Design a binder for this molecule. Structure first.
Ligand SMILES: Cc1nonc1CNC(=O)c1c[nH]c2nccc(Oc3c(F)cc(NC(=O)NCCCN4CCOCC4)cc3F)c12
Length: 269
């Protein structure tokens, strides 16, 4: 970490989104994104610096690269890879749905980042359209919206309360949902209240979900979904195993497909 105003280092060009806040900035002259975070009177910096460590030993082209953090006047700024098309979700919300082939290259890329994260025995915890970033070159980058009364709780409740039951494999499942999300503009049950959906998922009966249209997608896309969305984590394939899958290993898959999508985003019709 460095402790200073980062307005010395970079020029703040423009504001991209709220949450904390993210800004396009320039260093070197090269373009970075600055995630700003307002910390309260209760917030202790000692703990965020253990999560900041985990971000500096994340080197992967399929991972939004972390460049170095800054503490300044009750504000924490994270410098970061700039992906100037935003997220897949800001993209389909304009372009409509993605093609099977587009969706397939996105899925191979995510798996590439995942496999490396699981390599490092980390877990993304939050795979979705909103956390997959697209540079002006149509390359794909998993971003970190996530990792970026206990006194009375017992140790078992405490443990489960940091870790969740998150297993590296729940990242796979989530990708499955993300593919459907990208196919159909919405994940399963977006028009169903979220508690109900959490309950529905735990009955001994719950069938994993699937694409609505059947004709419109290859048998390989169908298998991809069937196999990623296995209920049992013992039986769900690893990300290195999923990179074998025929949906993500077929020829033709390259940034060109997404370049198409970025044009589609400028010139509709
Ligand atoms: C992961 C993430 N998601 O959002 N913010 C983050 C954290 N940023 C990053 O890690 C980034 C790292 N590098 C970046 N380079 C460019 C942008 C980046 O962040 C983004 C950002 F700042 C803004 C947006 N888009 C946005 O806010 N859109 C408004 C959508 C409004 N919807 C609401 C629902 O109803 C429909 C309309 C995307 C980013 F990816 C990053």
């Amino acid at each position: 970490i460095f402790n200073r105003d980062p307005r010395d280092h970079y020029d703040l060009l423009q504001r991209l989104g709220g949450g904390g806040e993210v800004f396009k900035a320039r260093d070197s002259g090269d373009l970075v994104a600055l995630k700003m975070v307002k910390m309260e009177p209760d917030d202790d910096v000692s703990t965020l610096q253990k999560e900041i460590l985990i971000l500096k030993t994340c080197r992967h082209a399929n991972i939004v690269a972390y460049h170095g953090s800054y503490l300044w006047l009750q504000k924490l700024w994270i410098c970061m890879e700039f992906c100037g098309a935003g997220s897949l979700q800001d993209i389909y919300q304009v372009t409509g749905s993605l093609s099977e082939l587009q969706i397939s290259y996105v899925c191979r890329e995510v798996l590439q980042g995942l496999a490396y994260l699981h390599s490092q025995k980390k877990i993304h915890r939050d795979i979705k359209g909103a956390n997959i970033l697209i540079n002006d070159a149509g390359e794909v980058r998993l971003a970190d919206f996530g990792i970026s009364t206990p006194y009375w709780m017992a140790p078992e409740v405490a443990a489960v309360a940091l870790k969740g039951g998150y297993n590296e494999l729940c990242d796979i499942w989530s990708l499955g949902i993300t593919a459907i999300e990208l196919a159909e503009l919405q994940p399963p049950l977006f028009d169903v209240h979220p508690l109900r959906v959490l309950f529905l998922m735990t009955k001994s009966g719950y069938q994993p979900p699937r694409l609505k249209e059947k004709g419109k997608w290859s048998a390989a896309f169908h298998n991809f979904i069937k196999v990623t969305l296995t209920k049992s984590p013992k039986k769900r394939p690893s990300a290195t195993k999923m990179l074998s899958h025929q949906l993500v290993s077929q020829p033709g898959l390259n940034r060109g497909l997404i370049l198409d999508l970025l044009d589609k985003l400028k010139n509709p019709g």
